[PDB]
Amino acid sequence: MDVILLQRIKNLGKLGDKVSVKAGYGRNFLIPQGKAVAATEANTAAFEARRAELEKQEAE
RNA sequence: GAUGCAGUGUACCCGCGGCUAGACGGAAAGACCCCGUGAACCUUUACUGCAGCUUGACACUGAACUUUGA
C-alpha cells in the first residue's frame, strides 16, 4: 500500500513523505497507531491543505 | 416303472373296525447341479473414484539486524 507518513519513522522518511510499504505493515501498525495515513486523494488534500503546518511544528 | 392301452385271469351290490405296499400320495414354481452378458454382502499387491492423513506454492503475513550459496 501507499502511505504518507504523519510523523517521523526511522527508515521510511520524515513528516509527509509518501512511501510504499507491505500491506500488513501499514494495515496493522502504522494506520491504527496514527503513524501514517493512506495516500488517497482526499487524505492528501487533508494533509497538505490545512494540517501540514500543524504536523510540522508538532515535531516532538 | 400303467386302475384306464393289448392279451388274459379273477370278480354279485354297499358299509364298519384296522393297515400303509401303490396312487412316481399331500406340503413348499429344488436349497444340490447348470444357465442368465441376474442380485446381494465380504476380501485383495483387480479397475476406477472419494473421505481422511500428508508435501510444497500463493493468501491471511509484519519490523529489525546478520551469516552463507550460484
Short mmCIF file of C-alpha atoms (C1' of nucleotides) in Angstrom, two decimals:
data_model
loop_
_atom_site.label_atom_id
_atom_site.label_comp_id
_atom_site.label_asym_id
_atom_site.label_seq_id
_atom_site.Cartn_x
_atom_site.Cartn_y
_atom_site.Cartn_z
CA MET A 1 0.00 0.00 0.00
CA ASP A 2 0.94 3.66 -0.44
CA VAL A 3 1.05 5.86 2.66
CA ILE A 4 2.00 9.38 3.68
CA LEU A 5 3.97 9.44 6.93
CA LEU A 6 2.25 11.63 9.51
CA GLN A 7 5.19 11.55 11.95
CA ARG A 8 8.84 10.59 11.71
CA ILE A 9 9.81 6.97 11.04
CA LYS A 10 13.30 5.56 11.45
CA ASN A 11 13.86 4.38 7.87
CA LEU A 12 10.74 5.33 5.88
CA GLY A 13 11.09 9.11 5.77
CA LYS A 14 10.09 12.26 7.60
CA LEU A 15 6.88 14.21 8.12
CA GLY A 16 4.85 13.79 4.96
CA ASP A 17 6.94 11.56 2.70
CA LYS A 18 4.93 9.16 0.54
CA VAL A 19 6.29 5.61 0.71
CA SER A 20 5.15 2.16 -0.38
CA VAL A 21 5.06 -0.46 2.37
CA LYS A 22 3.88 -4.05 2.62
CA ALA A 23 0.13 -4.13 3.15
CA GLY A 24 0.28 -5.80 6.56
CA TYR A 25 2.78 -3.29 7.94
CA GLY A 26 0.52 -0.34 7.17
CA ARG A 27 -2.76 -2.08 7.98
CA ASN A 28 -1.72 -3.39 11.38
CA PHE A 29 0.91 -0.99 12.73
CA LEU A 30 1.04 2.41 11.01
CA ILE A 31 -2.63 3.20 10.35
CA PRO A 32 -4.14 2.03 13.69
CA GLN A 33 -1.41 3.74 15.72
CA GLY A 34 -1.59 7.04 13.83
CA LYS A 35 1.94 7.00 12.39
CA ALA A 36 0.77 7.25 8.76
CA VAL A 37 -2.27 7.72 6.54
CA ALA A 38 -3.36 6.11 3.29
CA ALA A 39 -2.22 8.04 0.22
CA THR A 40 -5.65 8.68 -1.25
CA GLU A 41 -6.53 11.96 -2.96
CA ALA A 42 -8.85 13.17 -0.20
CA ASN A 43 -6.31 12.29 2.51
CA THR A 44 -3.62 14.16 0.56
CA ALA A 45 -5.90 17.18 0.22
CA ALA A 46 -6.36 16.97 4.00
CA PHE A 47 -2.62 16.61 4.71
CA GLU A 48 -1.05 19.39 2.65
CA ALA A 49 -4.20 21.55 2.61
CA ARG A 50 -4.62 22.54 6.25
CA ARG A 51 -2.93 20.41 8.91
CA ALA A 52 0.50 20.38 7.23
CA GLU A 53 1.91 23.23 9.32
CA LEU A 54 0.33 21.73 12.46
CA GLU A 55 2.09 18.40 11.90
CA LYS A 56 5.24 20.39 11.16
CA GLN A 57 5.56 22.39 14.37
CA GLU A 58 4.36 19.38 16.33
CA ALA A 59 7.81 18.00 15.55
CA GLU A 60 8.06 16.47 19.03
"C1'" G B 1 -41.65 -98.37 -13.73
"C1'" A B 2 -49.97 -98.44 -16.35
"C1'" U B 3 -56.68 -98.72 -12.46
"C1'" G B 4 -57.68 -96.56 -17.58
"C1'" C B 5 -53.60 -99.42 -23.96
"C1'" A B 6 -53.22 -105.23 -25.85
"C1'" G B 7 -53.93 -110.24 -24.41
"C1'" U B 8 -55.65 -112.86 -20.50
"C1'" G B 9 -57.21 -114.30 -15.31
"C1'" U B 10 -60.37 -113.24 -11.47
"C1'" A B 11 -64.59 -110.64 -9.62
"C1'" C B 12 -72.79 -110.31 -7.00
"C1'" C B 13 -74.36 -104.62 -4.66
"C1'" C B 14 -73.00 -101.39 -0.04
"C1'" G B 15 -70.83 -100.30 4.92
"C1'" C B 16 -67.79 -100.62 9.72
"C1'" G B 17 -63.07 -101.50 12.64
"C1'" G B 18 -57.87 -101.77 11.32
"C1'" C B 19 -53.26 -101.12 7.89
"C1'" U B 20 -49.85 -98.21 4.98
"C1'" A B 21 -47.36 -101.76 -0.39
"C1'" G B 22 -49.05 -98.19 -4.70
"C1'" A B 23 -51.95 -93.83 -6.45
"C1'" C B 24 -43.95 -91.63 -9.19
"C1'" G B 25 -49.54 -89.78 -2.29
"C1'" G B 26 -50.13 -84.04 0.33
"C1'" A B 27 -46.96 -79.94 1.71
"C1'" A B 28 -43.03 -75.60 -0.43
"C1'" A B 29 -42.57 -72.59 -9.20
"C1'" G B 30 -35.43 -77.86 -5.99
"C1'" A B 31 -31.90 -75.12 -1.49
"C1'" C B 32 -27.83 -79.84 -4.77
"C1'" C B 33 -26.18 -79.09 -10.41
"C1'" C B 34 -26.05 -75.97 -14.71
"C1'" C B 35 -27.70 -71.33 -17.27
"C1'" G B 36 -28.92 -65.56 -17.26
"C1'" U B 37 -23.60 -60.60 -20.77
"C1'" G B 38 -29.38 -61.69 -12.80
"C1'" A B 39 -28.80 -59.87 -7.17
"C1'" A B 40 -26.59 -59.04 -2.68
"C1'" C B 41 -22.73 -58.97 1.07
"C1'" C B 42 -17.37 -59.97 2.09
"C1'" U B 43 -11.82 -59.92 0.50
"C1'" U B 44 -7.45 -58.15 -2.03
"C1'" U B 45 -0.48 -56.20 -4.42
"C1'" A B 46 -8.38 -56.44 -9.85
"C1'" C B 47 -10.01 -51.32 -12.21
"C1'" U B 48 -11.66 -46.50 -11.26
"C1'" G B 49 -13.31 -42.56 -7.79
"C1'" C B 50 -13.83 -40.16 -2.90
"C1'" A B 51 -13.31 -39.17 2.63
"C1'" G B 52 -9.24 -38.98 5.90
"C1'" C B 53 -3.80 -38.15 6.54
"C1'" U B 54 0.36 -35.73 4.47
"C1'" U B 55 4.00 -32.20 0.91
"C1'" G B 56 5.01 -27.65 -1.39
"C1'" A B 57 3.26 -22.67 -3.79
"C1'" C B 58 0.06 -18.33 -3.26
"C1'" A B 59 -3.19 -15.55 0.55
"C1'" C B 60 -4.30 -14.16 5.81
"C1'" U B 61 1.60 -12.16 6.98
"C1'" G B 62 4.66 -7.70 9.76
"C1'" A B 63 9.61 -4.94 11.65
"C1'" A B 64 14.99 -5.06 12.52
"C1'" C B 65 19.76 -6.96 12.32
"C1'" U B 66 23.11 -10.94 10.46
"C1'" U B 67 25.77 -15.37 8.02
"C1'" U B 68 26.18 -18.19 3.75
"C1'" G B 69 25.28 -20.47 -1.66
"C1'" A B 70 25.17 -19.95 -7.65
#
